[PDB]
Structure formats: C-alpha cells, structure tokens
Amino acid sequence: ALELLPEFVRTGEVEMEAVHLERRDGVARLTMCRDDRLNAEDGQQVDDMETAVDLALLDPGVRVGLLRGGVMSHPRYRGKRVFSAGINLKYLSQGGISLVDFLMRKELGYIHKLVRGVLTNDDRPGWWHSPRIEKPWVA
Amino acid sequence: DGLWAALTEAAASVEKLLATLPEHGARSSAERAEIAAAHDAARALRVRFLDTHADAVYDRLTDHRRVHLRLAELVEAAATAFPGLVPTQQQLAVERSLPQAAKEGHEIDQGIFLRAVLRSPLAGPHLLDAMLRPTPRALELLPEFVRTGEVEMEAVHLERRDGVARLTMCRDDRLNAEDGQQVDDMETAVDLALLDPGVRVGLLRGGVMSHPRYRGKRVFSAGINLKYLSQGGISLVDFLMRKELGYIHKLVRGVLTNDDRPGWWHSPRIEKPWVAAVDGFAIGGGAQLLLVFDRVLASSDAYFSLPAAKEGIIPGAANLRLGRFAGPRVSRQVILEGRRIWAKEPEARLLVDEVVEPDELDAAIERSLTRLDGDAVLANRRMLNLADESPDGFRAYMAEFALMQALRLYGHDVI
Numbered sequence A: 001a002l003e004l005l006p007e008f009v010r011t012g013e014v015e016m017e018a019v020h021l022e023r024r025d026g027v028a029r030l031t032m033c034r035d036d037r038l039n040a041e042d043g044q045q046v047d048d049m050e051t052a053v054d055l056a057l058l059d060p061g062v063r064v065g066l067l068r069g070g071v072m073s074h075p076r077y078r079g080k081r082v083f084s085a086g087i088n089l090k091y092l093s094q095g096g097i098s099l100v101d102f103l104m105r106k107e108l109g110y111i112h113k114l115v116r117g118v119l120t121n122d123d124r125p126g127w128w129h130s131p132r133i134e135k136p137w138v139a
Numbered sequence B: 001d002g003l004w005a006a007l008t009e010a011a012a013s014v015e016k017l018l019a020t021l022p023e024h025g026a027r028s029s030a031e032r033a034e035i036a037a038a039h040d041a042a043r044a045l046r047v048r049f050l051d052t053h054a055d056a057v058y059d060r061l062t063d064h065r066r067v068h069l070r071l072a073e074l075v076e077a078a079a080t081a082f083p084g085l086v087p088t089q090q091q092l093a094v095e096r097s098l099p100q101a102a103k104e105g106h107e108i109d110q111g112i113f114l115r116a117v118l119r120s121p122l123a124g125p126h127l128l129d130a131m132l133r134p135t136p137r138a139l140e141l142l143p144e145f146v147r148t149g150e151v152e153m154e155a156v157h158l159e160r161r162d163g164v165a166r167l168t169m170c171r172d173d174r175l176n177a178e179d180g181q182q183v184d185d186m187e188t189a190v191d192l193a194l195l196d197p198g199v200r201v202g203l204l205r206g207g208v209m210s211h212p213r214y215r216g217k218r219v220f221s222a223g224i225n226l227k228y229l230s231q232g233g234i235s236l237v238d239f240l241m242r243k244e245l246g247y248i249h250k251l252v253r254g255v256l257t258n259d260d261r262p263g264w265w266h267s268p269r270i271e272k273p274w275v276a277a278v279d280g281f282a283i284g285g286g287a288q289l290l291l292v293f294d295r296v297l298a299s300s301d302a303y304f305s306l307p308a309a310k311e312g313i314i315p316g317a318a319n320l321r322l323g324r325f326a327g328p329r330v331s332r333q334v335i336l337e338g339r340r341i342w343a344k345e346p347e348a349r350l351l352v353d354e355v356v357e358p359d360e361l362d363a364a365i366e367r368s369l370t371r372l373d374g375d376a377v378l379a380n381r382r383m384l385n386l387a388d389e390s391p392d393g394f395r396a397y398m399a400e401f402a403l404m405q406a407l408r409l410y411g412h413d414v415i
C-alpha cells in the first residue's frame, strides 16, 4: 500500500486482481470485480482489499469510501453487479484458505481498518489526538 | 332513425380513401388528417346506432338470445350480417399482416360493438354466459384426457394427479410471455380441469425455463409478449377479450355446462378451487391472474407488477380487482405509478397467501392443495365470490374495457 501510494495519489486509479480502486469527487470507490466467480473471497482478494483500504485512507484527497460490486461476466449473471458470494467453497476443500494469511489477516487487517483506521507513524500534525486516520465508509 | 345507412355511407367514404390513398407511412397531413376525420365520423356513428339497436343486432345474430356464440363467432356473424359495423375476416387479415404501427385501427369497431353488447341487461349476460361454456377443443380432448391423465399443449402442460389438475406454463424460450395462442391452450387447460370428474383442485405454476438468464429455474409469467404487440399480433378480441371473458372468468365462476347431469338446477356451473404458485416473478397478466385464485403461494425471491404505467395498455381486469385486494391507494401506486410489491415486503400479503424459500416451495404447495378438498370449500368459495365481484360489476367493467382497451391498442405511445 505504501508502495503504490504516491502512484495512486497522482493517478487516481489503481487496478488490482480482485479490487479496483479509484478516487473521484473525493470518494475512494472500491469495486469488487471477480468477473468470473461472483467476487468469491480468497486469500489474494484479502490482499487487494487491505491495500485498497489503506490507499483509500492515506490518500489526503479521499474523504469517503465506497464498497460495491462490479458487473459480472458469468452467464447466470452477465451484465449485473453482485456484491459477494462469501468465501470460495472450492479452495476451502482444496487447502487454499489460510488460517493466518486469510481468515485472521482478514479480521485483524482490512475489516478492522474500516472501523478504527490506519495506524500511522508519528509524522503529521495531529497524531497526538488521532494516531489513526479513519474515514466514513459506505457499502 | 335512418341511422343505419347513415352509418353505412360513413363506412362508405372510409372504404373509398381506403384505396385512393397510398400506403400508411407515406401520407401527408391533409392526407392523414382526412382518413382520420373520416374514421371518427364513422366510429361516432357506429356508436349511436348501437346505443339504440344493440339488443336488436344481438337478437338477430343469436336468434333472440337463443344461441350461445363466443366472441370470435359473434363478431364474425356481426360482420357479414351488418357490413360496416365491424371488420370482416379478411379486413382484419390485411391488418394483422401490417405491423401494429401502421394499421388503420379496425379493431376499435369491434371495441365499439362488443361494448354496446355487454352494456345491455339482456345481451351482455348472454355473451358472457356464452364465454363460460366449454371450449370445443376442450370437449374434443376430454375423453382422451380422462383416460390419459396427460395433455401436452404448446404453452400449457396439463396433468391430473392425486386429484389435482396441475397446469404448467412452459414457454421454455420466452418466460411464459403471453400470446393469443397461449390464451387458447390456457382456456382449454381450465375446461378439461373443470370437467374431469377426477379433478378436485387446480394448480397453476411455471415450468423450468431454458433461456440462459434463467436456465434451470421456474418463472411464472412475464406478462404480455411486448414483441407481438408492436408487430400486430395481439388480438383485441381473440386475445385481450377472450382472455377476460374466457379462462380468467372460468377460474371464478366455472364452466357453464349443458343441462345433463344431476344437480344442474343448483349448480349450472361447475367450479373448483384453484391454487397459484409464483416462482421468480409475476409481471402483467401473470400478476392479474393472482387476483382470481383461492390461494396464492410465492417463493420469497418473487415480486409482482403491471408496470405498464406511462405507455402500456390497460392491465386487463386488474383495475377492477386490485382495488378490493389493496385499497384505492396502493391500487394506484401499482397501476398508475408503476410500483412493484416484493414477495417479502409486508404489503405482499395483500396479494399472496404464503411466502417461503424456493427450496421448500414444493411442499408448501403440496400441503396447500390438500387443504381445499371438501365440498364445504366449494360452497364457501362460491359465496365469497358472489360477494367480492358480482355479475353487474364485472359486466359494467368489461363493457368499457372492450372499447377503452381498443383505443389504448392503437395509441401512438403504446405502439
């Protein structure tokens, strides 16, 4: 996230496997876009996701976050958006859902950030009262 | 009086510019304005003549309310016995060939006729009684059905089982999109269902759909086929009227049979309770029918609407019934503003009886049919309808419909 921050601030657009971030009118719009699989979660999405949140929080140009689902390609839902079909039942049997790298990283990672924000380094005026940068989010 | 010929020269002029002028689509503007003015003076006359001579005209076509004639028959008979009053077979033919966008609107005359007919306290109850009598194609396949227990027809799939005449709307292409051929398989499914002594309760549901957007899932109905509507495939008589005076009315009062079988004195009509199950959705005529069944079931993922509001036509007999189901307030939010009630929102209980998850709808449905068996239900049903909707009520409404609808057919925006 700190890697793609500067690029994001100047660009206003970051494209990532599962999530598609984009700043607009002060909104860090995230877009769950698994145009195959109904946004079925998996420990790689949990990565694009936690990065989408961070960037969204650290971009001074963002005031409000938005989480929605992109249009789906699959036949049962072609041309229609879908929010999420939970966890990928497949990788679950196959041994692809990490207890740590996914199940835990998920609840201690991005989901927690949506509540309390990104704990930043003592750098920028205000840290004494707000060591964490939080912002309102809309789903 | 001399109203007749008056009317006649009127259809005369119209017949004239019916050739002189060029195809519809290349006229101008006193070209159009002239045919248009003509028609008006003609239709205007068609009305005045009937307001004072309908019963006569009707009496001559039916040997004084002595011969029951169905809609098609009656309008045809009318055509050859009173040229100018209503289109002839062929005349319509020319019409149906063109697309609903370029027709001269000859149906409107049938609309003016059928109206005056139902407006009479003599002819109307008779044209009605006549549309309640078993449909030939139905008396044709009756014996075969009774021995078989299965009739396969283009749009509908009938089947008797455990005393249930299960009908199954199966347009495995087009979401059961209604069309004047379905309205045929439908009215036959009902008749057979009613006349089969082995049937006690009817069931109307939607078969599984083949189309990609819905492959492997059932769908109740997507209303009327918007396509054939523009193309000129929706008959004012053979479909829009036949529909509300044909099967939909039978689901309420039953099949008017012949004096044959003991009991006719107290029950000249055989009626039975019917149960409708909704899968996916009930849009249009699909929804309209739910206002006539004894029990409506729907999966929680469903919704209903008639959302022809800003451009479409009149949603059948909904304007007549939706009132008694959900008040004048909702009634208008639905039909006037085009709103739709979702199966699960509280207000869905004004239309549906039970709402369950699709993976238990089957049992909800079965356990449903067994509850309307007794002859106690036949009586209570029958009285309840006598109260909800009465003979005069339906007649008066269907009268104005006959015309109103006609005009709504050949109206720029609907086209």
Ligand SMILES: CC(C)(COP(=O)(O)OP(=O)(O)OC[C@H]1O[C@@H](n2cnc3c(N)ncnc32)[C@H](O)[C@@H]1OP(=O)(O)O)[C@@H](O)C(=O)NCCC(=O)NCCNC(=O)Cc1cc(O)cc(O)c1
Binding pocket: A036, A037, A038, A040, A041, A074, A076, A085, A086, A087, A088, A089, A090, A103, A106
């Ligand atoms: C959503 C559905 C009902 C859709 O039904 P349909 O309209 O019948 O579509 P389908 O044909 O079944 O699926 C469309 C399409 O998406 C794919 N799809 C749908 N759901 C999934 C999931 N969950 N994973 C992967 N792919 C999926 C499906 O495989 C199809 O592609 P194909 O298999 O090639 O045909 C169905 O897909 C389904 O039942 N999915 C099961 C949903 C499910 O149970 N998810 C389980 C959720 N359980 C958790 O999230 C657990 C969890 C998650 C966490 O994030 C954290 C945590 O602590 C715990």
Ligand SMILES: CC(C)(COP(=O)(O)OP(=O)(O)OC[C@H]1O[C@@H](n2cnc3c(N)ncnc32)[C@H](O)[C@@H]1OP(=O)(O)O)[C@@H](O)C(=O)NCCC(=O)NCCNC(=O)Cc1cc(O)cc(O)c1
Binding pocket: B173, B174, B175, B177, B178, B211, B213, B222, B223, B224, B225, B226, B227, B240, B243, B283, B284, B285, B286, B308, B312, B313, B314, B315, B316, B317
């Ligand atoms: C139901 C829908 C919302 C479904 O959306 P989707 O999931 O987006 O499916 P679609 O891809 O649009 O359609 C699936 C499939 O069914 C076909 N379909 C769907 N609806 C129809 C209708 N109404 N007719 C014909 N074919 C239809 C559709 O053309 C598709 O096949 P393709 O065209 O080849 O793709 C859509 O099909 C739709 O909007 N239909 C419009 C429904 C409608 O407005 N019906 C109008 C109802 N108006 C009346 O019933 C008026 C009426 C009827 C009467 O019976 C009596 C009377 O007095 C008055």
